[PDB]
Design an enzyme around this catalytic site. Structure first.
Site, PDB file in Angstrom:
ATOM      1  N   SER A  93      41.827  37.784  42.044  1.00  0.00           N
ATOM      2  CA  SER A  93      41.164  38.080  40.804  1.00  0.00           C
ATOM      3  C   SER A  93      41.994  38.600  39.856  1.00  0.00           C
ATOM      4  O   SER A  93      42.846  37.764  39.163  1.00  0.00           O
ATOM      5  CB  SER A  93      39.879  38.751  40.892  1.00  0.00           C
ATOM      6  OG  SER A  93      39.810  40.395  41.013  1.00  0.00           O
ATOM      7  N   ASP A 214      31.314  31.905  43.760  1.00  0.00           N
ATOM      8  CA  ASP A 214      31.834  33.055  43.430  1.00  0.00           C
ATOM      9  C   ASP A 214      30.974  33.560  42.027  1.00  0.00           C
ATOM     10  O   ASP A 214      31.122  32.757  40.998  1.00  0.00           O
ATOM     11  CB  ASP A 214      33.223  32.969  43.186  1.00  0.00           C
ATOM     12  CG  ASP A 214      33.852  34.181  42.883  1.00  0.00           C
ATOM     13  OD1 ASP A 214      33.485  35.078  42.108  1.00  0.00           O
ATOM     14  OD2 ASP A 214      35.334  34.289  43.155  1.00  0.00           O
ATOM     15  N   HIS A 243      33.010  36.611  46.602  1.00  0.00           N
ATOM     16  CA  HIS A 243      34.286  36.899  45.707  1.00  0.00           C
ATOM     17  C   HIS A 243      35.388  37.389  46.659  1.00  0.00           C
ATOM     18  O   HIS A 243      36.359  37.617  46.143  1.00  0.00           O
ATOM     19  CB  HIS A 243      33.926  37.696  44.907  1.00  0.00           C
ATOM     20  CG  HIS A 243      34.896  38.119  43.736  1.00  0.00           C
ATOM     21  ND1 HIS A 243      35.385  37.170  43.004  1.00  0.00           N
ATOM     22  CD2 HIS A 243      35.421  39.322  43.166  1.00  0.00           C
ATOM     23  CE1 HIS A 243      36.303  37.738  42.175  1.00  0.00           C
ATOM     24  NE2 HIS A 243      36.201  38.980  42.275  1.00  0.00           N
TER      25      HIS A 243
END
EC number: 3.1.-.-
Length: 263
Positions: A93, A214, A243
């Protein structure tokens, strides 16, 4: 010193440096399930972003950390401090976003970029599906401010997915460890980032790993990345939602990493 502040830890043995860089809401402990698959063959470097709950909140200067650039400065500082000259880097991320900028600033530093749960831009734009709109995200930021605990309560299972209670429990633990104001501020920073302008400048070979569903990264983003990143790029899709696959599907993720990593 930065090595102490960001809880840098180096373990394992091998020629290749494997650098694991966690994302929003966790700390380096999110790597603990995949780490044993690599410590016999890789010298593994872990660290905590300054916004992690495991880092002294006194280090989080809201005056400094207003864009991703100071975060990249932290990473390169650690790399330099360790004397690392070349490594493979895995970023989840926000650490994926940080990795991209670091790669453009220091192209010789990375043998390979593995990017998990990565978007160059969350907000939609003309002919670009990031997955969010500005009105929408303002309400999330309000909810996060108004009642962080409730937000976490609801977000953790949604983000992580179903019938993976160990993963959800762990992600709840690390979200609750973050100072609420730091959480919100980091979220704002990420949502105000747009990397699409510089993707063509990436030269390092990159593997984009996405999961099936996600909540922060539409499926269309992976094929955008393949068409827009300047290096040799591949996309791998985990047959699993959520995620945080490093917690929810560690065996599959580790298998993907073992395929993609140099050596």
């Amino acid at each position: 010193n930065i090595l102490e502040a960001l809880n840098v830890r180096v373990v394992g043995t091998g020629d290749r440096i494997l650098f694991l860089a966690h994302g929003f809401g966790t700390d380096q402990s999110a790597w603990h399930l995949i780490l044993p698959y690599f410590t016999q063959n890789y010298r593994v470097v872990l660290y905590d972003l300054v916004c992690a709950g495991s880092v002294n909140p006194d280090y989080f200067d809201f005056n400094r950390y207003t864009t991703l650039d100071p975060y990249v400065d932290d990473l390169l500082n650690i790399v330099d401090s360790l004397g690392i000259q070349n490594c493979a880097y895995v970023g989840h991320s926000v650490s994926a976003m940080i990795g991209i900028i670091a790669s453009i600033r220091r192209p010789e530093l990375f043998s390979k970029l593995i990017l998990i749960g990565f978007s160059p831009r969350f907000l939609n734009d003309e002919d670009y599906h990031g997955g969010f709109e500005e009105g929408e995200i303002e309400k999330v930021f309000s909810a996060m401010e108004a009642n962080y605990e409730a937000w976490v309560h609801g977000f953790a299972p949604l983000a992580v997915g179903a019938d993976v209670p160990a993963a959800v429990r762990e992600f709840s633990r690390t979200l609750f460890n973050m100072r609420p104001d730091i959480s919100l501020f980091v979220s704002r920073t990420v949502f105000n980032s747009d990397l699409r302008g510089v993707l063509g400048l990436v030269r390092v070979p990159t593997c984009v790993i996405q999961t099936a569903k996600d909540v922060s990264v539409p499926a269309s983003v992976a094929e955008y990345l393949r068409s827009h990143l300047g290096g040799d790029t591949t996309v791998e899709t985990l047959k699993t939602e959520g995620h945080l696959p490093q917690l929810s599907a560690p065996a599959q993720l580790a298998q993907f990493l073992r395929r993609a990593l140099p050596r």
